[PDB]
Amino acid sequence: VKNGEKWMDRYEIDSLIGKGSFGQVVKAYDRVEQEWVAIKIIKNKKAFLNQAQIEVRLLELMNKHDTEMKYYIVHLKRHFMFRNHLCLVFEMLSYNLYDLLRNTNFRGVSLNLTRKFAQQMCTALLFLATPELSIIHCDLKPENILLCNPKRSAIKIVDFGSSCQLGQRIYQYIQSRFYRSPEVLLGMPYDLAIDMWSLGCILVEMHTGEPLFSGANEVDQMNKIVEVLGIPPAHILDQAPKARKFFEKLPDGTWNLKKTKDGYKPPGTRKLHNILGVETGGPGGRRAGESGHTVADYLKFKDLILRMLDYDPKTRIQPYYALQHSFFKK
Ligand SMILES: Nc1cc(-c2ccc3occc3c2)cc(N)n1
Ligand SMILES: [Cl-]
Ligand SMILES: [Cl-]
């Protein structure tokens, strides 16, 4: 698009912030408001235009709800069509939580900073669950959570490009694989609980520095989930279109892993207890003796994460109840 380019006697393009599947995000000066903005420029192809039109509708739907809880979502200032590209104008934010992890050399941030991110993200999910909204983000991951300010720990969620209201589902294959819920891996109709699953994955990663479940493909993904959480419950597998991609039903109505050639730990034996280092000074023992990282602080964190990683989307913890958990009590 080129630095120095002027649009509509209003925006002056400075530089490329980021590239997406959708098109590109540029830094631009708005002469009317007298402020810098992020312009998300959608590719001039029907597929990307039509999905971005849904993104604009969902962001405008959120903006018309003035509540405390709306201010953890990136603000869409406005949108327009230019040279046959849909253009979404956002507030400027800072760098993403993946960059934050990269900057720790993938050793993770403190339990105290993790808690601050968790509380903001739980508040965002509570907003999206407002009945009149019922928005599923569908692509929650560190790259999609941005700091408001490089000096501060305020965050906002970005990228509602995959997002849908409950009962407006388009695609069965959604979420980034590391953050994909068992219900999506199993080809089941999904609801807002898929974001809470992603969040559990994100919070463990923010503290250990490494993805909790880094599958190379869906079969590897489900195997890595099973290593930590065991075989999913029969009542879920009995209703799952894709259960037999991963599991086999026994004579007695019981399920087991499909095994391929080895060259995984037995189901439920890679304990989150050990991944977090609850009784061993935190991830890789690197938090030994630091304040805010006692066994008791760890056990509360472990408890909240295991509720976020319930296999059953029905009983998985919901945003309001996550905000009341002891992990967030002084
Ligand atoms: N909705 C949305 C927003 C952004 C966005 C908004 C403001 C920003 O400031 C700095 C980077 C950035 C990205 C990116 C995408 N892919 N989707
Ligand atoms: Cl990642
Ligand atoms: Cl997606």
Q: 3-state SS string over the chain?
A: CCCCCEECCCEEEEEEEEEECCEEEEEEEECCCCEEEEEEEECCCHHHHHHHHHHHHHHHHHHCCCCHHHHHECCEEEEEEECCEEEEEEECCCCEHHHHHHHCCCCCCCHHHHHHHHHHHHHHHHHHCCCCCCEECCCCCHHHEEECCCCCCCEEECCCCCCEECCCCCCCCCCCHHHCCHHHHCCCCCCCHHHHHHHHHHHHHHHHCCCCCCCCCHHHHHHHHHHHHCCCCHHHHCCCCCHHHCEEECCCCCEEECCCCCCCCCCCCCCHHHHCCCCCCCHHHCCCCCCCCCHHHHHHHHHHHHHHCCCCCCCCCCHHHHHCCHHHCC
**Ligand found nearest the CA of 163:** 3
In angstroms, this model's resolution equals: 2.0
15, 19, 22, 25: residue to mutate for ligand 1 pocket, most atoms within 8 A of CB: 25
Give domain status of residue 288, yes or no. Answer: yes
Residues 128 and 141 in one domain: yes
Q: Which amino acid is at 7?
A: W
Domain end: 92, 114, 140, which one? 92
Is residue 145 located within the same domain as residue 281? yes
What's the domain count of the chain?
2
Calculate helix-pair angle for 193-208, 111-128, nearest 10 degrees. Answer: 170
**Same domain (yes/no): 86, 103:** no
Q: Are residues 135 and 258 in the same domain?
A: yes
- Provide the domain limits for residue 321: 96-326
Q: Are residues 109 and 242 in the same domain?
A: yes
Both 242 and 166 in one domain: the answer is yes
If asked whether residues 199 and 64 sit together in one domain, one would say: no
Ligand 1 atom with minimal separation from the 91 CA: 7
CATH (domain of 43): 3.30.200.20
Active site annotation includes 139: yes
* Residue of 9, 66, 139, 312 marked catalytic: 139
Q: How far apart are CA 226 and CA 267, in angstroms?
A: 5
Residues 271 and 288 in one domain: yes
Contact between residue 248 and residue 258 where contact means Cβ atoms under 8 Å apart: yes
Pair 39, 58 in one domain: yes
Within a domain: 238: yes
Distance CA 242, CA 187 (A): 5
Same domain (yes/no): 165, 283: yes
The CATH number of residue 244's host domain is: 1.10.510.10
Which residues have C-beta atoms less than 6 Å from ligand 1? 17-18, 20, 25, 38, 40, 74, 90, 92-93, 146, 158-160
Q: Is the CB of residue 142 less than 8 Å from the CB of residue 158?
A: no
Query: Which of 92, 126, 144 corresponds to the end of one domain?
Result: 92
Q: Give me the residue label for tokens 């219900």.
A: 183
Q: In this structure, are 135 and 261 located in the same domain?
A: yes
Residue 1: inside a domain, yes or no?
no
